[PDB]
Design a protein around this ligand. Structure first.
Ligand SMILES: Nc1ncnc2c1ncn2[C@@H]1O[C@H](COP(=O)([O-])OC(=O)[C@@H]([NH3+])Cc2c[nH]cn2)[C@@H](O)[C@H]1O
Ligand SMILES: Nc1ncnc2c1ncn2[C@@H]1O[C@H](COP(=O)([O-])OC(=O)[C@@H]([NH3+])Cc2c[nH]cn2)[C@@H](O)[C@H]1O
Lengths: 420, 420
């Protein structure tokens, strides 16, 4: 009856392997930069996400799998990693390790939103963090690292997008501006936008429908960029300077609306055309102050996170495939009932250095050979009355048909030199 | 303010690495046996665990982190893997694959129980499964595989415990027996046991408190073993025969009541008497019928699962340690403010083939050298005015103190041949 809940799925075969390759590569580039692996629990006290992600965001307001611990305390299934990483930084007094403290991990994230192509309820993302410094070099580095992770995978058609939100103050002022300009024309907005106009109006910029877009154009709504505080623009230029020097092709966006409210200054996202909607492979930005929201000292930080699934789609789109599932090195086929147990014993002697499988019932040579082929076995091994009594085994390389009769002892050696 | 919820913790450093080693080894032995990796979602429809694990077990009754879908469906945080593996088997129609279908994975499990030493609310376990056959060879194999995973890790002081719970009929008869013997003495049972007496009385055997144990002893409650039917007894002997042949040292336990109700016939556990309470490194058994509980055809199956944390404790107990975390190949130290950015640029040119780190502020040679040593860097690199203008870098192997001045171009080559 039961099925895997909509939005989640079982990972196996090629799909699983691709995920493992993605994380493998990310592990290399990130750790090369001095990043330390740190894995946080699947759930945190609900507050860590409420206060951190911001009580006004969609995530916090209606996309968090939150439940109560038996007795008391409200816990929530981690929807994003940053807040957690900061929580960990505080808890372990990482503030005393040599700065900056770079952390990374790869794991599942849970968002209670209606699934569609690209939007899963349970997805997996690689997360990078650089805590303890305001220096714009880390911001550039963050962007470069994300860019490299996808680059190393073989992806070529990426679109990097940089921008800044200035700061909470600048953010507030832009919002007020949008309200003053849009409110008198409120009646021309899409129902969706009309709501967004109340809390965090910026969203109306990144909304759909022609109604909104045409209006924004005629009204001559000026970019968030024009509202950046000076020091903010200085910092952003530093980042650009570094990116340009490192030859990282990017496009400066008029405004990047990131789904999380803890962002301050730097904001970026890498996209891929070959995905349709949800072209965002990954995203990130600076988030100073978050630590304080969780009740800790001021700890500056930058970082990113990319969806492994999205990246997988991108790779597939660009014609990147994976090679066939390897079969057993040897598949033992019992010709007599007494042989089945003996096949098992032989198999165990070959393991784990050699992958040896066997049938659990006696069968005709042709049939067992059929199954060995059916399992992509390199060698087929026959165990009948003759070999059992002789303490030998009849091996047969399936690719050529070459057959050899040898003692049980030689089998490991023969197979290894013939396949290694 | 916030902390990692009690029962969970952040995995990093040596602790994290040990877990990775444990899973690494398990992956080898299991896949050598022909096991395929299959990862199920963190949560399933609450029913999968209610019906599967059995509505009478502690797990289902009061240890499941269950919550509601953002729109109805009751979901539960996976407390154990078998039921899920079976659910997956059914869903993907694995029944049409060549039998038996062996599956494995490693991941977090969540149990809402009060934590103590060894009992975490979020733990991780390696899970093995063999579906599609009743043949006792798989049961022996299962025990051998679990034994091998721990053996390969270097563990020597293990205690394998084998037993059986019989068939549904035998199971029923033993229950009736327990009721008849215990009911007239019902008043001497722990509140917990009094409930268990109603459905699946066997649990009262594996309960805690002195109240229950002393009573069971004086009442002379006979082991589940004495109630095995003919066929069950036959099957168990087959397993023993195989284990004995493979020289797997085990002890036949009188009553090995397992913590799950889906078990039928074979039941085993491996323990280590150096972890204190909760010595069970791992456990498993046969569970035919479970598939049917989930509304599917009859699918026989055997398997096990061991707690990575417990295994880690065991290894530690046996004096198994982990070596030193590798440091950066090169640590660039800026001597001027203009140098910091240049250090970053140089580092990025060396990455990812070479692990290059750097300081984010100018400092005295001696100080930067100390930091390079602190970080376990192989080579220290100086970037002062001279080298900046000369397009060179001053490298110094922290080991021999050998200092070299060379152009930025030669650096990658020099470092690689001197460390590879
Ligand atoms: N529903 C979904 N289905 C599939 N994939 C998804 C889904 N939602 C998010 N992702 C993936 O996670 C990536 C980053 O998500 P985010 O932009 O919310 O960032 C963050 O989470 C921040 N914590 C990043 C960060 C780290 N430090 C600073 N910022 C997206 O590019 C996307 O590929
Ligand atoms: N609270 C805890 N804290 C830390 N470690 C824990 C905790 N609870 C369980 N474990 C670990 O998981 C192992 C097996 O647990 P289980 O007896 O429920 O089995 C099963 O789950 C079965 N599904 C195994 C199986 C597979 N196929 C058939 N049977 C234990 O021996 C222990 O190492």
């Amino acid at each position: 009856t039961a099925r895997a809940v909509r939005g989640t799925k079982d990972l196996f075969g090629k799909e699983l392997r691709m995920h493992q390759r993605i994380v493998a590569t990310a592990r290399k580039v990130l750790e090369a930069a001095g990043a330390l692996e740190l894995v946080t629990p699947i759930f945190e006290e609900t507050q860590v996400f409420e206060k951190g992600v911001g009580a006004a965001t969609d995530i916090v307001r209606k996309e968090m799998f939150t439940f109560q611990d038996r007795g008391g305390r409200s816990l929530t299934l981690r929807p994003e990693g940053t807040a957690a990483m900061v929580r960990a930084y505080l808890e372990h007094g990482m503030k005393v390790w040599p700065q900056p403290v770079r952390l990374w991990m790869a794991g599942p994230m849970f968002r209670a939103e209606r699934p569609q192509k690209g939007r899963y309820r349970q997805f997996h993302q690689v997360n990078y963090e650089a805590l303890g410094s305001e220096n714009p070099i880390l911001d550039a580095e963050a962007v470069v690292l994300l860019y490299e992770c996808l680059k190393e995978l073989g992806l070529r058609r990426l679109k990097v997008k940089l921008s800044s939100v200035g700061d909470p103050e600048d953010r507030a002022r832009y919002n007020a501006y949008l309200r003053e300009v849009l409110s008198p024309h409120r009646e021309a907005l899409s129902e969706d936008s009309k709501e967004r106009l109340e809390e965090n109006p910026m969203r109306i910029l990144d909304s759909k429908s022609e109604r909104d877009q045409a209006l924004l154009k005629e009204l001559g709504v000026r970019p968030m960029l024009d509202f950046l505080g000076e020091e903010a623009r200085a910092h952003l230029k530093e980042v650009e300077r570094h990116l340009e020097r490192l030859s990282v092709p990017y496009e400066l966006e008029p405004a990047l609306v990131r789904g999380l409210d803890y962002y301050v200054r730097t904001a970026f996202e890498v996209h891929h055309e070959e995905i349709g909607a949800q072209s965002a492979l990954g995203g990130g930005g600076r988030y100073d102050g978050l630590s304080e929201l969780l009740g800790g000292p001021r700890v500056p930080g930058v970082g990113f996170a990319f969806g492994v699934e999205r990246v997988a789609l991108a790779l597939e789109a660009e014609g990147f495939g994976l090679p066939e599932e390897k079969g057993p090195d040897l598949y033992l086929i019992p010709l007599t009932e007494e042989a089945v147990a003996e096949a098992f014993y032989l198999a165990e002697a070959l393991r784990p250095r050699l992958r040896a499988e066997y049938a659990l019932a006696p069968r005709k040579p042709a049939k067992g050979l059929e199954e060995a082929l059916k399992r992509g076995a390199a060698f087929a091994g026959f165990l009948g009355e003759d070999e059992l009594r002789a303490g030998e085994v009849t091996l047969k390389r399936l690719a050529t048909g070459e057959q050899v009769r040898l003692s049980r002892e030689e089998v490991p050696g023969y197979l290894l030199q013939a396949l290694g």
